[PDB]
């Protein structure tokens, strides 16, 4: 019994550390999110203002979107929690193989197998989830931001340089943010209720 009580208390510590981690990465994705809101403001405002704006003006906005870009790489990179670049999109990709996943498991029970699985995948190079960074689109309008002068060449129809690919990349990118944040918060629910069973059962 003392075995189970001690191990369970230290397990409560473990779980609270998990709550800390997921809280950090979550707030990081919150910042990513609000930034991408500003990005969509700059894709509507970089609607060429139809064509009312100039390649000069859109070069200016594009400088802004590269600043915010490397800020998003900044979120996916600076999040070195205990030295873990958790929002390294590399860190936990399912990959359709066990070749390299690095499942960010947690340990809960004072007995064996009582573990949790965690999934953390975002990066500034992550956008519309075709499978991966498709090409110049579906990851790299987040990174490279085709609104330089390609977006003056056309604005509707070419499906790569025509506002619609781009705004769609922003949309699904932000939805990837949403989905992962929902996963993280789900984990936080499980850890709260988990500490409740640990603390009262252990009591």
């Amino acid at each position: 019994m003392r075995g189970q009580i001690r191990g369970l208390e230290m397990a409560s510590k473990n779980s609270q550390d998990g709550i800390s981690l997921i809280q950090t990465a979550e707030g990081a994705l919150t910042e990513t999110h609000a930034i991408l809101q500003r990005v969509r403001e700059l894709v509507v405002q970089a609607g060429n203002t139809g064509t009312q704006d100039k390649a000069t003006d859109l070069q200016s906005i594009q400088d802004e979107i590269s600043a915010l870009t490397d800020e998003i790489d900044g979120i996916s990179n600076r999040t070195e929690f205990n030295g873990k670049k958790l929002l390294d999109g590399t860190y936990k990709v399912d990959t359709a193989t066990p070749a390299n996943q690095k499942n960010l498991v947690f340990q809960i029970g004072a007995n064996a197998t009582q573990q949790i699985s965690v999934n953390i995948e975002d990066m500034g190079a992550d956008a519309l989830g075709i499978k991966e960074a498709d090409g110049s689109i579906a990851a790299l309008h987040s990174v490279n931001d085709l609104d330089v002068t390609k977006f003056a060449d056309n604005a509707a129809d070419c499906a790569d340089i025509g506002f619609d690919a781009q705004l769609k990349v922003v949309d699904e990118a932000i939805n990837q943010v949403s989905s992962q944040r929902a996963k993280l918060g789900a984990v936080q629910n499980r850890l709260e209720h988990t500490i409740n069973n640990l603390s009262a059962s252990g009591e």
């Binding site: 809280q23 939805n175 949403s178 989905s179 944040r181 929902a182 993280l184």
Partner: protein, 49 residues
């Protein structure tokens, strides 16, 4: 007893209450019921969109 005491529940209820009043602080502070957490995940992702 002199070895365990039985108001350990009190510690757990005080801990949960710390989570509670702290939580209500966090919401009144920002003036927001939406969680930074993915708690209320659909409310989050919808409101984001």
């Amino acid at each position: 007893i002199n070895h365990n005491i039985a108001a350990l529940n009190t510690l757990n209820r005080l801990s949960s209450n710390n989570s509670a009043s702290q939580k209500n602080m966090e919401k009144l502070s920002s003036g927001l019921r939406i969680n930074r957490a993915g708690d209320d995940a659909a409310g989050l992702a919808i409101s984001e969109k």
